[PDB]
Design an enzyme around this catalytic site. Structure first.
Site, mmCIF file in Angstrom:
data_model
loop_
_atom_site.group_PDB
_atom_site.id
_atom_site.type_symbol
_atom_site.label_atom_id
_atom_site.label_comp_id
_atom_site.label_asym_id
_atom_site.label_seq_id
_atom_site.Cartn_x
_atom_site.Cartn_y
_atom_site.Cartn_z
ATOM 1 N N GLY A 181 2.289 6.077 10.558
ATOM 2 C CA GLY A 181 3.707 5.969 10.227
ATOM 3 C C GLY A 181 4.331 4.663 10.687
ATOM 4 O O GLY A 181 5.485 4.373 10.354
ATOM 5 N N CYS B 264 3.330 1.606 9.802
ATOM 6 C CA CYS B 264 3.181 0.544 8.791
ATOM 7 C C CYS B 264 4.544 0.003 8.399
ATOM 8 O O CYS B 264 5.496 0.776 8.259
ATOM 9 C CB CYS B 264 2.410 1.041 7.566
ATOM 10 N N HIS C 205 0.799 -1.219 0.000
ATOM 11 C CA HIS C 205 0.000 0.000 0.000
ATOM 12 C C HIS C 205 0.845 1.290 0.000
ATOM 13 O O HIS C 205 0.276 2.363 -0.142
ATOM 14 C CB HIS C 205 -1.081 0.022 1.103
HETATM 15 O O1 LIG Z 1 -4.614 1.922 8.672
HETATM 16 C C1 LIG Z 1 -3.862 2.717 8.114
HETATM 17 C C2 LIG Z 1 -4.121 3.207 6.703
HETATM 18 C C3 LIG Z 1 -4.751 2.191 5.776
HETATM 19 C C4 LIG Z 1 -5.953 2.463 5.136
HETATM 20 C C5 LIG Z 1 -6.535 1.530 4.292
HETATM 21 C C6 LIG Z 1 -5.920 0.309 4.069
HETATM 22 C C7 LIG Z 1 -4.725 0.047 4.702
HETATM 23 CL CL1 LIG Z 1 -3.954 -1.495 4.453
HETATM 24 C C8 LIG Z 1 -4.130 0.967 5.546
HETATM 25 N N1 LIG Z 1 -2.751 3.215 8.689
HETATM 26 N N2 LIG Z 1 -2.435 2.863 10.000
HETATM 27 C C9 LIG Z 1 -1.797 1.744 10.426
HETATM 28 N N3 LIG Z 1 -1.639 1.699 11.725
HETATM 29 C C10 LIG Z 1 -2.225 2.880 12.193
HETATM 30 C C11 LIG Z 1 -2.445 3.309 13.501
HETATM 31 C C12 LIG Z 1 -3.188 4.467 13.709
HETATM 32 C C13 LIG Z 1 -3.703 5.192 12.631
HETATM 33 C C14 LIG Z 1 -3.473 4.785 11.321
HETATM 34 C C15 LIG Z 1 -2.723 3.632 11.128
#
Ligand SMILES: O=C(Cc1cccc(Cl)c1)Nn1cnc2ccccc21
Ligand SMILES: O=C(Cc1cccc(Cl)c1)Nn1cnc2ccccc21
Ligand SMILES: [Cl-]
Lengths: 298, 305
Positions: free
Chosen positions: A136, A138, A41
């Site tokens: 951030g 990920c 992603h």
């Molecule tokens: O969840 C996402 C963005 C996302 C949107 C759609 C699909 C996917 Cl695979 C990822 N980012 N993210 C990861 N750990 C986090 C913790 C707190 C906030 C945002 C955080």
């Protein structure tokens, strides 16, 4: 004495964390040999169509203060593999393993290719993890250490509306019925990891906490009829066999301990605690209990 | 989102752990530059521990009596000196993995990471706090002596604790890296016991602010309190007195959430009186006191949910 939520030393993993940037997105990558692994992603969906439009020079990889040159790129499920020019000299002995729900692992949480913290957690029966992540994070990884070999089992991808986390193994296959896109997704109803609660009750006995012990025993069938009513995972004969060493060390039979857990489930703790906890703890496996009450080193 | 007991990455500390042997005793040492730091009780026998004269035991030792091992390599000891309850072994090789470091003495209520080791090999990492009675509720076995406590704010490692002993209650006692014990303890096998423990009030308040940041407000009430009235109540529940310094330190969290410190104090008073009533706060049925105001600002988001 003492019983803490203990993580594996993170040093072998710290030397593998890098920062990956693609356009406006910035997240973490895992640099092993001449390949950097990160969530696909980062290019964001029709991922093959989005990836064909990118060149190697579009991906900025940074290891400390050094820019790593990307010379190739490919996708494996939900992970992007970036071929780099430099092999990581700090590459440890490692393997990619897929774990089952109930198993625990350490998470090295990173932001901008820099590790900020380490914590222990478990793969829930609903395939989510109750982690601690901000935007951030990920690309942060989950691992175990067996002797000198690091077993990479998780890569962070997303946070669900309830605040819990979802991700993949290092081969890009998600844990759970999740997909890496912005859509309506929710964690399923979760259950308690029964074998782990039992292991934690054995750890309490080892540390001198026996107030919850009784003279009673139970059948495996009667225990499971009770456990199913309290949203506890079914206890299998394999779990009973796995708890054998702890049963022998304490002199308390697994079904004898099951009758104690049955009484705790029906009556509660009555203002008492077990290992400094008013709740029944399910994020220590039988192997974690044996390792902490024996001092195994890495 | 989420709230975990988080330790600092241990890598910079792992590259400093060595094994120290003197006669029959074997424990851990901290190799920084050309010096290995370890508890001075490594020179003692089990018998000596009742009333040891460390100066008399040390004068009888030579450099070659101390075996130091870093991985599979034997280091050569070229000098030795005692500083309080720590033994400093001058070695012939400087540690190439020496990080940027400093020795800091912490106050009770402060948290730190512990890298637990056995035989100069790290086995685990966990987070913990210096209790008000100067003990730590660690997880240690025999052979863990010499294991260290640290914080890694920015790129520098601040070493604050070295493990020395376990008390009869199962809690742990140790020193700063200059060999001065935390608490009224001695590296002696004399009848010693931990003083009555108390809850770290400023930390419980910080953890309640972290719960508000993560979207939980069920415990808040419409009341406020005076600092004096709060302390009269808190003392009855074995809570540490909350000082004006503690109130000033909670200022940023108060501003971020819009909840005044003495209003958060009123909610704590209510929680002590009523309990949780089958509810949890950040996945816990007990009031958590091992997260400092600084830890909450570090782990939590800058945007309240
Ligand atoms: O969840 C996402 C963005 C996302 C949107 C759609 C699909 C996917 Cl695979 C990822 N980012 N993210 C990861 N750990 C986090 C913790 C707190 C906030 C945002 C955080
Ligand atoms: O307590 C000691 C030895 C000792 C005795 C008296 C004084 C001094 Cl300074 C040292 N070792 N130790 C440290 N952590 C432990 C945990 C479990 C068992 C033994 C453990
Ligand atoms: Cl301090």
């Amino acid at each position: 004495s003492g019983f803490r939520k203990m993580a594996f030393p993170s040093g072998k993993v710290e030397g593998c964390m890098v920062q990956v940037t693609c356009g406006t997105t910035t997240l973490n990558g895992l640099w092993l040999d001449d390949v950097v692994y990160c969530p696909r992603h980062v290019i964001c969906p029709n991922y093959e169509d989005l990836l064909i439009r990118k060149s190697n020079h579009n991906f900025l990889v940074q290891a400390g203060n050094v820019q790593l040159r990307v010379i190739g790129h490919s996708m494996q499920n939900c992970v992007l593999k970036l071929k780099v020019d430099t092999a990581n000299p700090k590459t440890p002995k490692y393997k990619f393993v897929r774990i089952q729900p109930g198993q625990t692992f350490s998470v090295l949480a990173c932001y901008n290719g820099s590790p900020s913290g380490v914590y222990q957690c478990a793969m829930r029966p609903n395939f989510t993890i109750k982690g601690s992540f901000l935007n951030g994070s990920c690309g942060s990884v989950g691992f175990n250490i067996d002797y000198d070999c690091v077993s990479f089992c998780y890569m962070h991808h997303m946070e669900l509306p309830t605040g819990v986390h979802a991700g993949t193994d290092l081969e890009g296959n998600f844990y759970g019925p999740f997909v890496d896109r912005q859509t309506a997704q929710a964690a399923g109803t979760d259950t308690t990891i029964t074998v782990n609660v039992l292991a934690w009750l054995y750890a309490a006995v080892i540390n001198g906490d026996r107030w919850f012990l009784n003279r009673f025993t139970t059948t495996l069938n009667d225990f499971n009829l009770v456990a199913m009513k309290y949203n506890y995972e079914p206890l299998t004969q394999d779990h009973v066999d796995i708890l054998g060493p702890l049963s022998a060390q304490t002199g308390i039979a697994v079904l004898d301990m099951c009758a104690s857990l049955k009484e705790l489930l029906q009556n509660g703790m009555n203002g008492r605690t077990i290992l400094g906890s008013a709740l029944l703890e399910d994020e220590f496996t039988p192997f974690d209990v044996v390792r902490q009450c024996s001092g195994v080193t890495f």
